[PDB]
Amino acid sequence: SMSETFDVELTKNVQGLGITIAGYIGDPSGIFVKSITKSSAVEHDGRIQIGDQIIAVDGTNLQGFTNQQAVEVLRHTGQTVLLTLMRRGETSV
């Protein structure tokens, strides 16, 4: 197994952060970056990539949460956000 964990301090503009994030919902888990908007704060920063897992927001660890619970933390953020992400490079399946 191998992963990278990193954090990114971001300040929203008119387009917000500029990421679309998703996880499985219904009856491993997690929420992941699906897309990054052109000219967004996230794109400008350059570190975050599609497939990165969001594992913490503003001091709140998300890894024990339901995916929708985690989504709601992101939805209710203020203008400045500290995101912690995990990027998996090797897995055993």
From Swiss-Prot:
Subcellular location: Cell membrane; Apical cell membrane; Postsynaptic density; Cell projection, Dendrite
PDZ domain sequence ranges: 7-89
Tissue: Expressed in heart, brain, placenta, liver, skeletal muscle, kidney and pancreas.
General function of this protein: Member of the NMDAR signaling complex that may play a role in control of AMPAR potentiation and synaptic plasticity in excitatory synapses. Promotes clustering of HT2RC at the cell surface.
Clinical condition linked: Hydrocephalus, congenital, 2, with or without brain or eye anomalies: A form of congenital hydrocephalus, a disease characterized by onset in utero of enlarged ventricles due to accumulation of ventricular cerebrospinal fluid. HYC2 affected individuals have variable neurologic impairment. Some individuals have other brain abnormalities, including lissencephaly, thinning of the corpus callosum, and neuronal heterotopia. Most patients have delayed motor development and some have delayed intellectual development and/or seizures.
Quaternary structure annotation from Swiss-Prot or TrEMBL: Interacts with CLDN5, DLG4, GRIN1, F11R/JAM, CLDN1, NG2, CRB1, MPP4 and PALS1. Interacts with HTR2A, HTR2B, HTR2C, PLEKHA1/TAPP1, PLEKHA2/TAPP2, CXADR, SYNGAP1, CAMK2A and CAMK2B. Interacts with FAT4 (via cytoplasmic domain). Interacts with DLL1. (Microbial infection) Interacts with human adenovirus type 9 E4-ORF1 protein.
Domain remark text: The PDZ domain 1 binds NG2. The PDZ domains 7 and 10 bind the Ad9 E4-ORF1 oncoprotein. The PDZ domain 9 binds F11R. The PDZ domain 10 binds the C-terminus of CLDN1 and KIT and the C-terminal PDZ-binding motif of HTR2C. The PDZ domain 13 binds CXADR. The PDZ domain 2 binds CAMK2A and CAMK2B. The PDZ domains 10 and 13 bind PLEKHA1 and PLEKHA2. The PDZ domain 13 binds SYNGAP1.
Protein name: Multiple PDZ domain protein
Organismal lineage: Eukaryota, Metazoa, Chordata, Craniata, Vertebrata
Shown chain mapped onto the complete sequence: 373 to 463 of 2070
